[PDB]
């Protein structure tokens, strides 16, 4: 019927004075734009069809053509920034917002989706969608006693669109928009659908990716316990954003970090630091590095949960980027830790794998390790065991590596290595 029309036939039908011919041509356009292989987005734009689709969004007495044009425009807006911009430039944003209140759920859903693609283009279009007033009607769609009475796909699209209104930086979303969205977002974060949970966690991760004031906005809503629960989920698409959110939160103040610890997060890190997905291990070790950059009582809670052996393990064997995060976690630990915590770190076996990482061709990790080693030596000086440490570093071949660092192509590396071999191995 409407399968595989040419752009020319679509144009002919949409330019007729016949609402039904326009409906069939718009459906044919929708089908072209929904084909799996390279939809003719640019051809549809160059035909000048976006304005007509936008006008069709307003034809209340023909809900089928509203739906079909909403879908066509959704898929145009799914493309490049230029194609989304073509949709916006046609006046689509206000028409979709007006469709959010459509009594036909499939049409409102299509408007939600379209607005999500527009907002997903980036910060400018996100904020323009917000200025046109999309948040009120979007959240009104979710103002029900129990989210379970909404259709799974409807709810998933609403959540994904909201996540895009929370996404992107430079600039971040308007503070008032975030505050308006958060109560609904937290309600979705407690819903039982894995895709709703994943996109809610992503939204929260976006909101916590920034200065401490944004973190505080989120933490004040009490979502941290729920984030830790999701951190222990089986579905990787949930763990990943939950871990990202937790990592963001612990980049904030020590109080925010403590909220994460008190929620029980550290108990999940035995699994996360041994998680077979490289990205989980990396992000978990990054989160650990930011926790070991906290207070001494927080380092102490890292110790109490038994995570130092897991950092020793990561340092001993993991993808290099994870090992770099583990090196950072060790340097932070040794910069902020007590002498007893630093010796405990050594008794867990940190020295050998740290020295083994000194044979890397990356200069940052080298400097990080030398700083950690120096901090450990300073601890030994406070204990008088500097010589025992020097010996330990020598047995595992570390002295050779430091001597080689003397002839390194970096100045700070040279100064650190020379300083170590002069203050200790002399």
């Amino acid at each position: 019927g409407t399968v595989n029309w040419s752009v020319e036939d679509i144009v002919k039908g949409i330019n007729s004075n016949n609402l039904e011919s326009q409906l069939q041509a718009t459906q044919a356009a929708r089908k072209l734009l929904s084909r799996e292989k390279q939809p003719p987005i640019d051809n549809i734009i160059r035909a000048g069809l976006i304005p007509k689709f936008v006008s069709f969004l307003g034809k209340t007495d023909c809900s089928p053509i509203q739906f079909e044009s909403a879908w066509a425009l959704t898929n145009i807006a799914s493309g490049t920034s230029e194609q989304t911009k073509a949709v916006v430039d046609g006046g689509a944003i206000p028409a979709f917002i007006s469709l959010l209140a459509s009594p036909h759920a499939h049409i409102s859903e299509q408007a939600v989706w379209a607005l999500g693609n527009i907002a997903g283009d980036g910060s400018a279009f996100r904020d323009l969608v917000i200025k046109h007033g999309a948040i009120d009607p979007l959240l009104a769609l979710l103002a029900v006693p129990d989210l379970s009475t909404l259709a799974c796909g409807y709810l998933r699209n609403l959540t994904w669109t909201l996540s895009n209104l929370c996404r992107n930086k430079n600039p971040a979303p308007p503070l008032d928009a975030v505050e308006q969205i958060l109560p609904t977002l937290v309600r979705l974060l407690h819903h039982n659908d894995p895709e709703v949970l994943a996109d809610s966690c992503w939204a929260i991760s976006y909101l916590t990716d920034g200065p401490n004031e944004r973190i505080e906005m989120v933490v004040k809503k009490g979502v941290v316990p729920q984030l830790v629960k999701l951190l222990g989920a089986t579905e990787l698409p949930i763990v990943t954003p939950a871990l990202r959110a937790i990592g963001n939160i612990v980049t904030g103040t020590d109080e925010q970090t403590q909220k994460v610890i008190d929620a029980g997060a550290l108990a999940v890190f035995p699994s996360l630091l041994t998680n077979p997905k490289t990205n989980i291990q990396k992000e978990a070790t990054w989160t650990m590095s930011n926790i070991t950059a906290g207070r001494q009582d927080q380092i102490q809670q890292v110790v109490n949960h038994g995570l130092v052996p897991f950092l020793v393990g990561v340092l001993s064997k993991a993808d290099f980027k994870t090992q770099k995060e583990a090196a950072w976690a060790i340097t932070n630990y040794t910069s902020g830790g007590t002498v007893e915590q630093i010796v405990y770190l050594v008794h867990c076996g940190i020295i050998e794998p740290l020295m083994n990482l000194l044979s890397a061709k990356d200069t940052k990790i080298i400097q990080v390790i030398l700083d950690a080693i120096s901090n450990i030596f300073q601890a030994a000086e406070k204990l008088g065991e500097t010589e025992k440490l020097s010996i330990m570093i020598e047995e595992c071949g570390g002295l050779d590596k430091i001597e080689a660092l003397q002839r390194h192509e970096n100045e700070s590396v040279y100064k650190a290595s020379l300083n170590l071999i002069e203050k200790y191995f002399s």
Binding site: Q110, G116, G120, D121
Partner: peptide, 8 residues
């Protein structure tokens, strides 16, 4: 798919 979603 995360930024933009084409409806197929």
């Amino acid at each position: 798919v995360q930024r933009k979603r084409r409806k197929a």
